[PDB]
Design a protein around this ligand. Structure first.
Ligand SMILES: [Mg+2]
Ligand SMILES: [Mg+2]
Ligand SMILES: [Mg+2]
Ligand SMILES: [Mg+2]
Lengths: 1021, 1021
């Protein structure tokens, strides 16, 4: 009766931050209740721990109030059979909302909307009579979003908030032998939502596991581990504090044993009863053991040395009541003298922020996915990850512990959408709610070695609540530093200056919360903390420009210990078309309102875990070996702090314009922080013209746990020499004929013919034989289909006049009209010479001026020479080159320049100069939100079909015009055009990326010279 | 229905620390909602604020569950008419429990006993229709102990915990015009009780006021004041931050005006909208004004300069929506360089701890009582008070603000009875509950100038919860320091070393939490904070010995800035006898179990506010003027920091053995921290024998607000000279006759006769004429009826073998038997000489040996000469002297020695040497728990009836034998004995008092010499 919906729902606990839970057990590290020490030691599975994951019955309602009392007693006819865990939006019930800042619901704390999507889950299951004789049977939900009430066998059990941490209830007295039934009612919105405003899809449900754990009556209630070291780490102390619940009987003992493999390293036994703590005594229900470990193997992301710790609760006669365990990693984390140290050396964090996202499963995580992510990261030169912005699925820590990644664990607290940001975090009334989001995290994850820093949440301004919570942590677990960026990045609530999007060299001095240039921030008066960016280098779409600038500061300034790139995966979701064809969806694609569109796609990898090209630029910049070339000696520097180059080979090689002349291989013997000298054999040197390039690669000959054999971990290339070509071509056998007309000029020579339209001034067509080559005339191009960064936050509604695109738009770039100023043909001794001039103007303003000369010679080669003039007072153009639509469509593209991957000017350090050959398909980058892409810089020669262009340029080539790109919201809607679109740039502006909501292109990468010159040679084979 | 007891009670919110309140409004400074600025300015009364204090209907139940649903709807036949506020134990419902540490209920957090005394209060009242048109009508309870549920017009309103702070609910929508009814159900025990384990009577009910406040819809929700100063305090800034609730309309304004009297000093006006705080902006519902004040009058306990601040919320057209106000005191509090400063100078805290206690009303406070207390304190040289151990009744701060006392405001948190002490305070699950006890206190009291330090609670060990809360405060209100003694007195949670019962010179090194000698504590390595004792000098019963030692350190060591004596009033309660006669009751006197007996009586004043003699010793030691005598020049030093001696006269005077020879009066002109020189007139000097004494007194000629005219604020006395008596008496005219017998020796001379019993060796009787003088023989006395300090915590059950009494008991002191060793009479030329010797022994051990000579001469004077030998190995005796029971009973006592008040050896600095004459009645000190009392030291002559004794001794005289004292638990049970009991001590051991649970008598005051000598002269007039 008092179990009635009617009664229960009445209190509206989900509209009250003063009730965060009802009858929930305390937090603690992961338990299994093994009843045999070996299983515990070997991490075998505990029969005392049962999963309730699977098929559950579910029914959706628009408001908690629309639930029928019947539900409590019996299933529902119309209840569907759903799989758990899952996100009900993933099943169709309601839509997922992709909003960033702006809260999904209306801001009226602590109220929530009356229309509040309720999901009723139920499960019928069996409890074995043995579980009811003794012990305690409790239930666990690893993640319920956002809040929920619970009934068992028609009785009300409890309530819980906090989507990202476990809620546990003792079912001990509601359970009946055999058949039991659970009724779980999950509310989408609650007062907890006010604290969960992270930039991500807004979903709901029982999205993490459900389990049953059977514990003895007298049991281990919690335990913590700690490791102290001596000056040189040659000796450690493992300290374990154990607490128990139940009746304390003198025959009770505890044994803590430390294994390393099969080998027991240390063991300790004792009975309950701690040291005197105060005037009343000590804890009789606790015991602390201390094990001495000589020459412990240390844990690090470089070498994840782990031990196993077993905690046995037994009686003195040797009888085991129960056992728990955890992996142990010996490491010390400290900030000392402005530096963050790990095991005494200073880290350089090569990290990334990662959300729990699956395109198919929404926010439900699985082992496979976790592992994939981990390996990609490790393969790509990452050390660390930040749990943006809440505690993750438990297994995560374990994997990191094991594979080796540093983890920053973060409280599930984000109130980004309040005004001001502080509003709740400065309010004592939210102190409790917040408090639980921090404390429980710590109680749960504190024993993992991978966790090296605690974070108070994200973007919730800076309030007195943070200060308190930060102090709490420091008191409770001084083993790790605390960080929080809110309120300016350097408040009293953080041990590290941890801004987001601070530029390297430029300051952004917003009122109250400026973002100084990182190099400058450190030397502000009185400042002494280390600086590590919590988010930097916004990887949204065609991005990552300038990435290297960061890497270089990091390397030059000690107190700049790296940062976390934003972010790992694109938060795109899968949708299906008219023919059961899938496609990547984003903000607002689910009729979701209000929404932030593409803003959910900032990953380095696509939702399927396939990489964006940016990923390489990272990989290379973050590489652990560094090179310098001096004469014919290569100096190698190791950035490893703990390990020796012991699975590393260096391959070297010399080549002249793509042609290999020499190769070597040399095994690296460099210690962490060491140098290795490498002298090269006498290097060949040819008479032939061209550039000679040295390229080196570090290879991992043997496979590791996260890499295959032959994995390349680093590389670098240098230009060694140049033999300039002092050779004049063979005087043409033939001579081209010029046929004039009033419409055009024709040039014929051989089967070849070229036509220039005298009215437009462009080369309108060309034939090889009877076949035409163009579909579109060759013409000047000064624009580009806007990248995400060019656009920023500019919308049709709300225009951002500062966004590059807006400027360009406003100035007429996109709609300027050419103007023939001149077009002449002249006959040279051995060639024809065409000469043109256009002016591009908009509203009587001449933006640019293009002046060319085409010169066709007996060789049947045309040489284009171009010279642009850009008005000082017009926004600098995105680019400067030509384009045209070719008639042909070939299978491959071959070029001699940077590649193989897409590379832009402020994003090309990872690319190598060489001869690349790839399929056309590979020259297009499927950024879900179409834009200019696929560029390759420093090209010297490009070959497509019978064409060959030569010079110094950047280019791109696909089946999509710039216009089509520019006009398609999703990549799935693009259609291949008639032939091949070719864009050949003499120059291209950088892509930026410091952030994606303001101009981020550094000046060095802006086409601001005024005068631009370039030349090409088009010809055939 | 869901309003039903049945439903409500179901959740058992009082057995859950996760629910501290339900539907309670936020905390804030005191509001009145004046609707006229002048009333506000002048503190007139607000018609918008109505008291519901008075006659209420009440009914008591043994368990919440025994309440009848009817109650919600209608009064109860048997409900009585009680007055509110009150403590129901004060009315008879149940008993008050006097327990210290040990919790009243059984320790099973968060559970409470099923038998849980519920008090149902109800009130029928009228609401004026106007209040319901608009605005908000809310209710306030200033104190409900311990927890409660609330209904209005049969509807459930909310719940609340925290006995010592206000709970407010919006009744706006439950109210009906005209007749309304409240039903309040108050639970004695709740999960809140675990946090309220203060050493005091355990009571319950609606013990502070009940009010109704009507506010506008658009109102002032909170406001704070702050004052900054310049280097020399010649200029200040008053800063007021105001927040409002309701709809924000551009025509809204705020005006803050500062008055000094009638004179407006400054005013400021502005509209809502603060400065940018973070990335989202500012508070639109707040405004901060800053007023400049030139040469502000500063507030201090010496001179409570106050201003009035008025906060008006109006529209721009000048229309007043509403006004609030508060008194403002300009003062700066800072710890700087190890010192605690007030307005730039370093305080010396002369303070005391005070509980809210009334012998009649239990824990209900009234203005009269508050005021009495204040004045007594100020009169007695106190500067400050500590709110042991919870927030006090609101008016308190106001009075302190006004009369001038420094206040330490303390959170209502004491978990003394847990094991260990830390148990809850270290538990994250109690963090929220604790949090509210701190935060609300601050939000409420933060604007009072008298509050200069915040305290986190008392005796709750040291947990991570404290650290967080301490940081919170520092963040929120950096204007004051925070202190907390738990866990060792010098933790990271306190800005001041604030121990309790630390001795001056001796260390008490308990494990974990030692108590170093205060002088030593300061120089412990790394230590730099100031030290102020939160409790020192346990004033239980006959106490305060050694008080001066403290005063002297305080004066010599800068970093020793004083302390808080423990405590102000005796927590005794009034009971009535068989004839409606009242008497002072204590622990366990209400059949209360378990209990701490007298432990509740440690005040300096009795519950009726009549002083214990200790009070003087304080007054004198804490005096603000200090003297030194050099020749005939008196040097006066002022300890005032801010004020000039401007109501001070110095009276001086010289006297020879009680006889006045000279007097002066001199006006003091000494500045704070200054010296004044005073040269005395040529001082007379007589030939006559005797001691010449100089005595000076400082007088307050004019009355102040807390003192009458002619109040004496200080004094000091010196001995100037001594003219020794070289005069031999006039050779006796007569000669005494000795008549022997086998039973005794008789001496006759004149009407006078003396008889010494030859079997016992004592003077058994004496006659003047036909009248006998003794009822009991004159005999040696080595014991005393144990003071509270002699006993300590020793009980009959649990004996404390270290307690003085125990030692004495065990050694046979109390039951030793005399032994005539010798008894002889001899005839001298002009006198008779008796000579005796006894041995006191117990179990064949001779404890002491007494050797006398009585010598009676022609003058009819007996001279007693005594010489004791004390065994090295026996506990030192409490005293050494004689006693006897006189037959007479006279009305007065006159003596020449220290007085006039009771004075002991380690407690006599406040006493003066002179001739005192008082009524017998005044020679007895009515300590509720009878013990040795009334002593007066340094006596040279004592007169009672026809007797006169002369020498150097300490003595006491009443109608109660030591034995009677020793055997009566309460003073009300003592009965006057046949005549007058006289105790004349050659020597007396000190009383101690550093604490009352371990030996506190300093060695200098212990009778440890072995050999003791003394002489008397008994005679008549
Ligand atoms: Mg809630
Ligand atoms: Mg955000
Ligand atoms: Mg509660
Ligand atoms: Mg206590």
């Amino acid at each position: 009766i008092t179990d009635s919906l009617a009664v229960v729902l009445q209190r509206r606990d989900w509209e009250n931050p003063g009730v965060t839970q009802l009858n929930r057990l305390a937090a603690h590290p992961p338990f299994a209740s093994w009843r045999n020490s070996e299983e515990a030691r070997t991490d075998r599975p505990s029969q005392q721990l049962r999963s309730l994951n699977g098929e559950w019955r579910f029914a959706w309602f628009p408001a908690p109030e629309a639930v029928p009392e019947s539900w409590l007693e019996c299933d529902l006819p119309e209840a569907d059979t759903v799989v758990v865990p899952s996100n009900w939006q993933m099943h169709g019930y309601d839509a997922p909302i992709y909003t960033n800042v702006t809260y999904p619901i209306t801001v009226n704390p602590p109220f929530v909307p009356t229309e509040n999507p309720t999901g009723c889950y139920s499960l019928t299951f069996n409890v074995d009579e043995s579980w009811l004789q003794e012990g305690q049977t409790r239930i666990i939900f690893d993640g319920v979003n956002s809040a929920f009430h619970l009934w068992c066998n028609g009785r009300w059990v409890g309530y819980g908030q906090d989507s990202r941490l476990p809620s546990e209830f003792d079912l001990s007295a509601f359970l009946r032998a055999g058949e039991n039934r659970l009724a779980v009612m999950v509310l989408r919105w609650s007062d907890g939502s006010y604290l969960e405003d992270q930039d991500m899809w807004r979903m709901s449900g029982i999205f993490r596991d459900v389990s049953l754990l059977h514990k003895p009556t007298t049991q281990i209630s919690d335990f913590h581990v700690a490791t102290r070291f001596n000056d040189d780490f040659s000796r450690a102390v493992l300290e374990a504090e154990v607490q128990m619940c139940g009746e304390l009987r003198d025959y009770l003992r505890v044994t803590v044993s430390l294994w390393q493999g099969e080998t027991q390293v240390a063991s300790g036994t004792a009975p309950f009863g701690g040291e005197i703590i105060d005037e009343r005594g000590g804890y009789a229900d606790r015991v602390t053991l201390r094990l001495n470990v000589e020459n412990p193997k240390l844990w690090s992301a470089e070498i994840p040395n782990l031990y196993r710790a077993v905690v046995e609760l037994h009686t003195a006669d040797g009888t085991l009541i129960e056992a728990e365990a955890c992996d142990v990693g010996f490491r010390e984390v400290r900030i000392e003298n402005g530096l963050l140290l790990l095991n005494g050396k200073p880290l350089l964090i090569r990290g990334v922020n990662r959300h729990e996202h699956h395109p198919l499963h929404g926010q439900v995580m699985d082992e496979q996915t976790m592992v994939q992510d981990i390996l990609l990261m490790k393969q790509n030169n990452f050390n660390a990850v930040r749990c943006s912005h809440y505690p993750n699925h438990p297994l995560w820590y374990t994997l990191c512990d094991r594979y080796g990644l540093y983890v920053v664990d973060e409280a599930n607290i984000e109130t980004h959408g309040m005004v001001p940001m502080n509003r709740l975090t400065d309010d004592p009334r939210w102190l409790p709610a917040m408090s639980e989001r921090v404390t429980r995290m710590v109680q749960r994850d504190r024993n993992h070695p991978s966790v090296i820093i605690w974070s108070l949440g994200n973007e919730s301004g800076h309030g007195a609540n943070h200060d308190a919570l930060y102090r709490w942590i420091k008191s409770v677990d001084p083993s790790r530093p605390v960080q929080y960026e809110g309120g300016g990045a350097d408040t009293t609530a953080t041990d590290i200056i941890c801004p987001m999007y601070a530029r390297v060299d430029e300051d952004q001095p917003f009122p109250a919360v400026p973002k100084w240039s990182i190099k400058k921030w450190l030397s502000l008066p009185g400042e002494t903390r280390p600086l590590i960016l919590c988010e930097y280098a916004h990887a949204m779409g065609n991005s990552l420009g300038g990435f290297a600038k960061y890497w270089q500061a990091f390397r030059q300034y000690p107190r700049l210990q790296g940062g976390f790139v934003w972010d790992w995966v694109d938060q795109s979701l899968i949708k299906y078309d008219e023919n059961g064809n899938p496609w990547s969806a984003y903000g607002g694609d689910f009729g979701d309102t209000p929404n932030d569109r593409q803003f959910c796609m900032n990953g380095l990898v696509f939702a399927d875990r396939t990489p964006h090209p940016a990923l390489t630029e990272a990989k290379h910049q973050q590489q652990f070996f560094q090179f310098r070339l001096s004469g014919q000696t290569i100096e190698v520097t190791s950035e490893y702090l703990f390990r020796h180059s012991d699975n590393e080979l260096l391959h070297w090689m010399v080549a002249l314009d793509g042609k290999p002349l020499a190769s070597g291989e040399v095994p690296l013997d460099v210690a962490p922080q060491g140098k290795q000298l490498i002298e090269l054999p006498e290097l060949p040197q040819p008479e032939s013209a061209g550039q000679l390039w040295l390229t080196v690669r570090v290879v991992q000959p043997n496979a590791t746990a996260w890499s295959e054999a032959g994995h390349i971990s680093a590389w670098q290339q240098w230009r060694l020499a140049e033999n300039l070509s002092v050779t004049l071509p063979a005087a043409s056998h033939a001579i081209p004929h010029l046929t004039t007309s009033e419409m055009d000029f024709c040039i014929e020579l051989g089967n070849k013919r070229w036509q220039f339209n005298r009215q437009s001034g462009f080369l309108s067509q060309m034939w090889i034989g009877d076949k035409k080559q163009l579909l579109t005339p060759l013409r000047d191009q000064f624009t580009r289909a806007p990248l995400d960064n060019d656009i920023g936050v500019s919308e049709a509604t709300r225009i951002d006049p500062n966004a590059w695109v807006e400027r360009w738009k406003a100035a007429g770039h996109y709609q300027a009209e050419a103007a023939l100023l001149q077009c002449t043909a002249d006959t040279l001794a051995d060639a024809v010479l065409i000469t043109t001039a256009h002016a591009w103007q908009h509203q009587g303003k001449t933006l640019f001026i293009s002046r060319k000369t085409y010169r066709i010679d007996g060789s049947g080669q045309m040489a284009i020479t171009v010279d642009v003039e850009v008005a000082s007072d017009t926004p600098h153009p995105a680019r400067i080159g030509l384009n045209c639509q070719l008639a042909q469509v070939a299978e491959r593209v071959n070029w001699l320049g940077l590649g193989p991957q897409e590379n832009y000017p402020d994003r090309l350090t990872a690319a190598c100069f060489d001869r690349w050959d790839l399929p056309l398909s590979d020259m297009y980058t499927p950024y879900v939100f179409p834009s200019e892409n696929g560029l390759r810089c420093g090209t010297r020669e490009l070959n497509y079909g019978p064409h060959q262009w030569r010079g110094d340029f950047q280019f791109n080539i696909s089946r999509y015009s710039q216009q089509q790109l520019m006009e398609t919201s999703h990549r799935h809607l693009l259609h291949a055009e008639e032939g091949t679109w070719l864009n050949i740039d003499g120059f291209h502006m950088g892509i930026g990326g410091d952030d994606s909501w303001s101009p981020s292109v550094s000046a060095e990468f802006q086409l601001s010279a005024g005068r631009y010159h370039y030349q090409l040679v088009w010809c055939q084979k």
